[PDB]
Design a protein around this ligand. Structure first.
Ligand SMILES: CCCCCCCCCCCC(=O)OC[C@H](COP(=O)(O)OCC[N+](C)(C)C)OC(=O)CCCCCCCCCCC
Ligand SMILES: CCCCCCCCCCCC(=O)OC[C@H](COP(=O)(O)OCC[N+](C)(C)C)OC(=O)CCCCCCCCCCC
Ligand SMILES: CCCCCCCCCCCC(=O)OC[C@H](COP(=O)(O)OCC[N+](C)(C)C)OC(=O)CCCCCCCCCCC
Ligand SMILES: CCCCCCCCCCCC(=O)OC[C@H](COP(=O)(O)OCC[N+](C)(C)C)OC(=O)CCCCCCCCCCC
Ligand SMILES: CCCCCCCCCCCC(=O)OC[C@H](COP(=O)(O)OCC[N+](C)(C)C)OC(=O)CCCCCCCCCCC
Ligand SMILES: CCCCCCCCCCCC(=O)OC[C@H](COP(=O)(O)OCC[N+](C)(C)C)OC(=O)CCCCCCCCCCC
Ligand SMILES: CCCCCCCCCCCC(=O)OC[C@H](COP(=O)(O)OCC[N+](C)(C)C)OC(=O)CCCCCCCCCCC
Ligand SMILES: CCCCCCCCCCCC(=O)OC[C@H](COP(=O)(O)OCC[N+](C)(C)C)OC(=O)CCCCCCCCCCC
Ligand SMILES: CCCCCCCCCCCC(=O)OC[C@H](COP(=O)(O)OCC[N+](C)(C)C)OC(=O)CCCCCCCCCCC
Ligand SMILES: CCCCCCCCCCCC(=O)OC[C@H](COP(=O)(O)OCC[N+](C)(C)C)OC(=O)CCCCCCCCCCC
Ligand SMILES: O=C(O)/C=C/C(=O)O
Ligand SMILES: O=C(O)/C=C/C(=O)O
Ligand SMILES: O=C(O)/C=C/C(=O)O
Ligand SMILES: O=C(O)/C=C/C(=O)O
Ligand SMILES: O=C(O)/C=C/C(=O)O
Ligand SMILES: [Cl-]
Ligand SMILES: [Cl-]
Ligand SMILES: [Cl-]
Ligand SMILES: [Cl-]
Ligand SMILES: [Cl-]
Ligand SMILES: [Cl-]
Ligand SMILES: [Cl-]
Ligand SMILES: [Cl-]
Ligand SMILES: [Cl-]
Ligand SMILES: [Cl-]
Ligand SMILES: [Cl-]
Ligand SMILES: [Cl-]
Ligand code: NA
Ligand code: NA
Ligand code: NA
Ligand code: NA
Ligand code: NA
Ligand code: NA
Lengths: 311, 311, 311, 311, 311
C-alpha cells in the first residue's frame, strides 16, 4: 500500500465532506466545542480497477488495511479524532468512496467583545500532507457537506455550516499541505442573561439610588454598601463564566462602570452628611435633589455611549 | 463476509431491542445521561442456514469476525458506544441472534419550562446505513425491549421505556438510513426543592414584610437589603444547577418576580420615611397599613397567574 | 473453544471469589464507589484433564485464548471492568483455577435518611449468562472472599465484606442468568460534621437568641438577619455535598426547622418593637421574658421528637 | 515462555528499582498522587545464558514476547500502571536487565492532624505473585532507586525516596506474595497559609475585640456578627481544601475555638447593654474592662495549650 | 531491527525538530499546558542506503516496524505522548526522515512572584536513552523548529519558541542520556485583572476611607466592616485562581497589605468614638483630620515600595 500513481504529473485530488450529527459542549472559557460528524472522502486509485463481469460484483468493499487511504487530519483539534470507518466502496474505474463517523474537541477562538449579544464563526480545518511520490490536494464535494436538523448547541443558534471550497495550499517542512476551512456560524441566545444577570443588577443599582430620598447617613451607608456587595457577587459570577480577555467586553464595561456609580453615590452620601453635621442642610439638600436626576440621566447616557461603542 | 443476498429485491430487516441495566448521571446543564444496556440484533442470513436433522445441533455459535454483522450506531451519542459482544447464535433457517452489552453518554435535550415540576422524554436513536449490495431496515422486537427494576435515576421517577415501532427511513448522502426512536419517559422528584429552595426563599421574603409593622427606617433598610442579598444567593444557586434557556422557566419566573417585590418594598420603606421626615406620618401610616395587605395579596395572585401560565 | 460438556444434564458451577485490594472514591452525590480487587474463578473442564505420571507435571498453565473461560460480568458497573489475568492453572482432573485483578466504578444506591449518622450496604453483583449448549450457575468459595487490612475508604468505617452464597437464577432475554450478591457493609465517620457543621450552626442560632435580652429593634434586626444569612451559607454547603432525595434527611430536617426558629424570632422582635412604640412595654417585656425560655425549650423538644423519628 | 527453573529449590529473586521522573497532582481530599518513573527489574534466567567468546557479543537484546518476564504490579494504585518498555538486555550468565517507564495514580493515605505544618510518608508498594512452578521474591537494588533534581511537588518539599530493603513475604489465596515498600518522604510548604488564611482570620477576630472599647450596642452587634460571618467564610474555604477526618486537625481546632470566642463576645456585648439599660453602667464598665485583657490573654493561652497538644 | 552500527566509535546523532500546531489549556494551579505538535527526527542508517540508479527511486518509504527507530521520549510529561507517524522517508545515503504528530500534557513550573505582570519560559524536554550497542546523541535542526501563526494560548502572549541547540548529555543508571531543551516564551495578558480585580478592590478600600469624614461610629463600623468583607471575597477569588507558593506574589502582597489598612482604620474609627464619648472631640477631630491624609499617603508609598521590590 503506497499512493496511486499519476497518469500525467497532476496532484491527487481528495474530495471531502463533513456532515454534522452532534454539536455539543461549547466551552466559552476553553474556546472549544465537541463535534460528532460524518467525514466522507473520495479519490481515484486505478490500481483498484476491476471488471464486474469477472469479479461478480458491481461495487467492491475493502477493509482500511487492504487499500491505500490518504492520511487526513484536523488542524485545530486537542487530540486526533476518534474515528470509526462506516464504509469503503470501490467502483470498477478505481474510484474510492470512503466514509467514517468521527468525534473531536475542536479549538476555535471566540470574540467576546459583544457578549452576551455576540456571534461566532467556528472553524474545522481539514488538512492533508503530500507524500514524496506525489502531491495531494483537497477538494469540497458540496453534495456531501451539511448537518442534521436535530443539531442543537445549548444556548446558541446554529446559523450555517459551509466550506471554503478553495483550499489553502502551502509549504511546511519541505512538503506541501492542502488545508480546507469548514465554517460553522452560530449566534448566542442572549435571552437568559436579561432576567438572570442584567435586570437583577439594575434593580440593586436602583435600590442604592433610594439614598437620594434619605437624610439618614446610617441607612444610606447600609443601602449603598449592601447593594455594592450584591454587585460584586454578580461581577464574580459573570467573570467565572468567561475567559480573561486582553480587551473589554460589553457586559464587562457595564459591570465596571456601575462600580463608578456606587463610588460616586458613596461620595454623595458622605458629602450630604458632612454638610448636615456642619449645620448647612440647605447645600446638602440641593446636592441630593440634583443627584436624584443626575444619577439616572448620566447612567442612561453612559449606557447609550457604551452600546454605541460596542455595536 | 459481505451482506446476505436478497431472495427477491426486499430490504434486509434487522430486529432490534434495548434492555436498560443502568441509567445514571443525568446532567441537566449538559442535557446528557449515561446508559448501560443490552443491545439485541436479529436478521436472516440464508448462507448460514443448516439442516437441524443432519447437523445434530439445533443452534450454532459464531465469533463476530466469522460472520457478517450489520454496522449499527446511535445517532445522539457523544462518542461511539463502548460495546462487548455477549452472544451470537444461528438457528437452522439461518436466523442470527446477536447480543452485546454497551455503555454510552446520550445527548437528549430537556424542557425546563415547568422546572422543578417537569417531565422529560429521553431519546436513544438507533440507526443503520444501507450498503451498495442491499438496503437495511430496522424493526422493533417488543419482546426484547425493557429495563430492570433496579434501574434508578437519582432525583427522577422512571415512567416508561418504549420504542416507536415504525422506523424513520430517509436518504442521507446517496444511501438509505433506517432510524429507530427508543423513548425513556421520566418525571422529576420535585420533593427536595420545597425544603431546600422554595420554603427558605418564601421565609426570607416574609421576613422582609415585617418592615410593614416598623417605623424604624434604619431597621427596615437592614431587613429589606439583607433578605434581598439572601435571595440573590438562592438565585445564583438555582442558576448554577440549570442551563441558560432561551425561554423562562417556572422557578426562574418566581425568582425574578420576587426581585420586583423587594424593589417595591424598598420604595415603600423610602416613601414611609420621607413622609415621616416631611412631618406627615398620617399618610405614611395609611400607605404602610395598605402594604400589610397589598404585598401578600398581590404576591398570592401573581403566583396563581404564573402557575396558570406554566401549567 | 466452546463450554465443557455435561456428564449428565447438570449445570456448570463456576466458583467465585472477590478479594478487595483498594476501596476508594465513594461519591455520595453520584452514589458510586471505585473498586480494585482480585476476581477468582474455578470450574471443571474434563477436556483439559491429564495423567500427572506421563505428563510429568501436576499443574498446567494456559493462556486465556488457549482454553474456554466463562463470560463473567458485573451488573452494577458504569463501564465493563478493566481486568488483567494474573494466572490460569489446571489440575489433573481438569479443574481450572483462574485469577484476575480488576478495577471498576460500581453504582450502588445509598440511604441518606440518617445522614451523617448513616450506614450503607454497598453491592457488587457478579453475573453469568447461560449458553445454548449448557446452563452456567455461580457459587461462592468463602475461602477466596475477603479484603486486606490496608482497605481504607475515606470518611467511612468498613464493617464487613461477605457474599450471599445462594445465587439468584432468573431468565433474561430467553437465557438463564446466575447473579451473586457481594455486600460491603460500611458506616459513616460522623465526627467531622460536629465541629464543621453542627456546632457552628448551633452557635449562630444561640447568638440570634441574645435578641431576647435586648430592647434595641435595630440591633435585634441585625442579629437575627445576619445569623439567618450564616445559616443559609451552611444549608447551601450541606446541600452541595448531598444528592437531591425524594425524602427528608436528618441534617436536612434540623436545617429546615432552624429556618422556622429564625422566622418566629423575627416575629417576636417585630412584636416587641410594635408594642414598645404603641406605648405598652409591659406586654412586650412579658413576651420577651417568655421567649428566653420558650425558644430553647421548644428547640430542645423539637430535636428530641426529630431524633426519635429518625433513629 | 515459562518461569526459569530452579537449580535447587531456591526462590527466584527479582531485583527492583524505581527512579522518579515526575511527581505531581497530590490531591489532599482524594489522598492520591500521580507519578512518572522508571521501573527497573533484574533476575537470572539460565536458559538465556550464552558464550561471549564465540557469540562475539557481550550483550543480547530481546523483545518482551521473546522472553519470560515476571508479572510485577503495584498494590496501592487506582488502575494498573500505564507502562512502555525502554530496554531488555541479557548478559552471558543469563542475567536479564529490564527497564520500563510507567505512570500511575497512587492511593496513599495522609495524616492531617498537624495541618498545614504536617509531613507525610507516601508509599509505593511493589508486589509479585509466585507461580505454581516456582516462588518469586522481590529485592531492592539501591543503585537503581532514586529521583531527579527536577522532581517538584507543588506546595511540598521532597525530603527522601527510599526503599524498605526487606520484602514482606506472605500467603494470599494459596500462593506466596513478595511486597516492597518504596517510601517517599515529603513536608508541606506551610508559608502560603499564614498571609492567606491564618493572619486574615486573626485580623477579623481582633477587629471583633474593638467592641470592648465601645458602649454602642448597635455598633458592637454589627462588629461581632460581621466578623463572625467573615470567619464562617474562612472555615468553609478551609474545609473545601481538606477531607473529612475522624480526628481534629490543627487548623480545624483553632477555627472551632474562635467560634467560642465569638460566642462569648456576643454574651459580653449583650451583658454590657442589659446592665447599661438596667441603669448599672458601673458593673457593665468593669466587665468590659476585664474583657479587654481576658479575651486576648485566654486566646493566647488556649493557643499555647492547643499547639502543645498537637506538636 | 537493531541500531545502525558505527563506522568508527562515534555516537549516533538524531536531528530533532518540534513544530507547534496547537498550544492550549495552560493551568496555573497545576503548572501544566497541553500541546499538539509535529516531531521530526533524522539520523543516518548506512544499512538502509541504496543506489538511486539501480533501484530507480530517489526516496524510499518504510513502515515503523520495517526499520530501526530511536526510542524518543519527553521528560516533563504526565503520560507518554499520544503520537501518530505521518511519514518515514530514506534518501540514497541512508538518511532517515521521520515525522509524527503528537499531543502531550507537559508539566513545566511557573514563577508567580510578579503575577499578574509575569512572564514564563515553558519547557519541552526531548530525551534519548543510549543502547548497549551504541551511544545516541540529540541535535537541533533549526530548519524544522517552529510554530504556526494560529497558535493561541488564552490569556497569554506567545513571544518565542526556540531550542537550546547543545544537548545536556548525562549518565543515568550506567547509560547515557541526551536531553534537549525546547523553550516556549510567553507573557501574561494582564489587562483583564485591572477592571476585574485591581480597580474593584481599590474602590472598596477608598469607600472605607469615607469614614474619615464621618463622626457616626455606627455608620463607620458598617463602612469598614462591609468593605473588609468585600475584600475577603476578592482575596478568596484570587487564591482560587493560583497555586500555594512558598513565596509572596505581587497580588498576594498587595491583598495582604490592604488587610492591615482595614485593621488600622478599625483602630482609628474606635479611637475617634472612645474620645468623643470621653468628652474630648478635639483630640478625635485632629486624629481623623490626620487620617484623611495619612491613609492615602501611606497607601501610595507602601505600594511604590512593594512595586519597587517586585519589579
Ligand atoms: C444596561 C444595558 C442593557 C443592555 C441593552 C442591550 C444591548 C443591545 O442593544 O444589544 C443588541 C442586540 C442585537 O445585536 P445585533 O443587531 O445582532 O448586532 C449588529 C448591529 N449593527 C449591524 C448595527 C452593528 O440585541 C437586541 O436586539 C436587544 C435586546 C436586549 C435588550 C436588553 C435590555 C435590558
Ligand atoms: C400578635 C401577633 C401575632 C403574630 C403572628 C404572625 C403570623 C405569621 C404567619 C406566617 C405564615 C407562614 C406574611 C408575614 C408578614 C409579617 C408578620 C408581622 C407581624 C407583626 C406583629 C405586630 C404586632 C401586632
Ligand atoms: C409618590 C412617589 C411614588 C414613587 C414610585 C417610584 C417608582 C420608581 C420606578 C423606577 C423604575 C426603574 C429609577 C431609579 C429610581 C430610584 C428609586 C425611587 C425612590 C422614590 C422615593 C420617593 C419618596 C417620596
Ligand atoms: C411560590 C411557589 C409555590 C409552589 C409552586 C407549586 C407548583 C405547582 O402547582 O406545580 C404543579 C405540579 C405539576 O404537575 P402536573 O400535575 O403534571 O401539572 C400539569 C397539569 N395539566 C396537564 C392539566 C396542565 O403539580 C404537582 O405535582 C403539585 C406539587 C405541589 C408542590 C407545592 C409546593 C409548595
Ligand atoms: C450573668 C450572665 C451569665 C452568662 C451565661 C451565658 C449562657 C451560655 C450557655 C451556653 C449554652 C449552650 C442559649 C442562648 C441564649 C443566649 C444567652 C444570652 C445572654 C444573657 C445576658 C443576660 C444579662 C443579665
Ligand atoms: C441538634 C444536635 C444533633 C445531634 C445528633 C445526634 C445523633 C443521634 O442521636 O444518634 C446518631 C447515632 C445512631 O445510630 P443507631 O445505632 O443506628 O441508632 C438507632 C438505634 N435503635 C434502633 C436501637 C433506637 O448515634 C451516634 O452516633 C451518637 C453520637 C453522636 C452525638 C452527636 C451530638 C452533637
Ligand atoms: C493562630 C495561631 C497560629 C499558630 C501557628 C504556629 C503553629 C506552630 O507552632 O507550628 C509548629 C511547627 C512544627 O513543625 P515541625 O518542626 O516539623 O514539628 C516537630 C515537632 N516535634 C519536636 C514534637 C517532633 O513549626 C513550624 O515550622 C511553624 C513555624 C511558623 C509559625 C507560624 C506562626 C503564625
Ligand atoms: C467636595 C468633596 C469631593 C471629594 C471627591 C473625592 C475624590 C475622588 C477621587 C476618585 C479617584 C478614583 C481616597 C478615597 C477617599 C474619598 C473620601 C472623600 C470624602 C468627601 C467628603 C467631603 C466633605 C466636604
Ligand atoms: C492606640 C491603639 C493602638 C492599636 C493596638 C492594636 C495592636 C494590635 C497588634 C497585634 C500584634 C499581634 C491584639 C488585640 C487587639 C485588640 C484591638 C483593640 C484596639 C482598641 C483601641 C482603643 C482606643 C482607646
Ligand atoms: C495597586 C496598584 C496597582 C499596581 C500595578 C503594578 C503596575 C506596574 O508597574 O506593573 C509592572 C509591569 C511591567 O513589568 P516588566 O515589563 O515585566 O519589567 C519592567 C523592567 N524593570 C524590572 C527593569 C523595571 O507592567 C506594567 O507596566 C503595568 C501597567 C498597568 C498598571 C496597572 C494600573 C492599575
Ligand atoms: O448513521 C449515522 O451514524 C448517522 C446518521 C444521521 O445523523 O442521520
Ligand atoms: O449479564 C449481564 O451483563 C446483565 C444482567 C442484568 O442486567 O440482569
Ligand atoms: O496484585 C497483587 O499481586 C496483590 C495484591 C495484594 O496482596 O493486596
Ligand atoms: O529517558 C527518560 O524517559 C527520562 C529520563 C530522565 O528523567 O532523565
Ligand atoms: O498536516 C498537519 O497535521 C498539520 C498541519 C499544520 O499545522 O499546518
Ligand atoms: Cl484517515
Ligand atoms: Cl484529526
Ligand atoms: Cl455492531
Ligand atoms: Cl454508537
Ligand atoms: Cl471473564
Ligand atoms: Cl464487568
Ligand atoms: Cl511487568
Ligand atoms: Cl500496576
Ligand atoms: Cl519514537
Ligand atoms: Cl513521551
Ligand atoms: Cl555524568
Ligand atoms: Cl553508555
Ligand atoms: Na490504508
Ligand atoms: Na462481522
Ligand atoms: Na445596620
Ligand atoms: Na477463552
Ligand atoms: Na514475556
Ligand atoms: Na522500529
Amino acid at each position: 500500500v503506497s499512493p496511486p500513481p499519476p497518469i500525467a504529473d497532476e496532484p491527487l485530488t481528495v474530495n471531502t465532506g463533513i456532515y454534522l450529527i452532534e454539536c455539543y459542549s461549547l466551552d466559552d472559557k476553553a474556546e472549544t466545542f465537541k463535534v460528532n460528524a460524518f467525514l466522507s472522502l473520495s479519490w481515484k486509485d486505478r490500481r483498484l480497477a476491476f471488471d464486474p463481469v469477472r469479479s461478480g460484483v458491481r461495487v467492491k468493499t475493502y477493509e482500511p488495511e487492504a487499500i491505500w487511504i490518504p492520511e487526513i487530519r484536523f488542524v485545530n483539534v486537542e487530540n486526533a479524532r476518534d474515528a470509526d470507518v462506516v464504509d469503503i466502496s470501490v467502483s470498477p474505474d478505481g474510484t474510492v468512496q470512503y466514509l467514517e463517523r468521527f468525534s473531536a474537541r475542536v479549538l476555535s477562538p471566540l470574540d467576546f467583545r459583544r457578549y452576551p449579544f455576540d456571534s461566532q464563526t467556528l472553524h474545522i480545518y481539514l488538512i492533508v500532507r503530500s507524500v514524496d511520490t506525489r502531491n495531494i490536494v483537497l477538494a469540497v464535494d458540496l453534495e456531501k457537506v451539511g448537518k442534521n436538523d436535530d443539531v442543537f448547541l445549548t444556548g446558541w443558534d446554529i446559523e450555517s455550516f459551509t466550506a471554503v471550497v478553495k483550499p489553502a495550499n502551502f509549504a511546511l517542512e519541505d512538503r506541501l499541505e492542502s488545508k480546507l476551512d469548514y465554517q460553522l456560524r452560530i449566534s448566542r441566545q442572549y435571552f437568559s442573561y436579561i432576567p438572570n444577570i442584567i435586570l437583577p443588577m439594575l434593580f440593586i443599582l436602583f435600590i442604592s439610588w433610594t439614598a437620594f430620598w434619605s437624610t439618614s447617613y446610617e441607612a444610606n451607608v447600609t443601602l449603598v454598601v449592601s447593594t455594592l456587595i450584591a454587585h460584586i457577587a454578580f461581577n464574580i459570577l459573570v467573570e467565572t463564566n468567561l475567559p480573561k480577555t486582553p480587551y473589554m467586553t460589553y457586559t464587562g464595561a457595564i459591570i465596571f462602570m456601575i462600580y463608578l456609580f456606587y463610588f460616586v453615590a458613596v461620595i454623595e452620601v458622605t458629602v450630604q452628611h458632612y454638610l448636615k453635621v456642619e449645620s448647612q442642610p440647605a447645600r446638602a439638600a440641593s446636592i441630593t435633589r440634583a443627584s436624584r436626576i443626575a444619577f439616572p440621566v448620566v447612567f442612561l447616557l453612559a449606557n447609550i455611549i457604551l452600546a454605541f461603542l460596542f455595536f
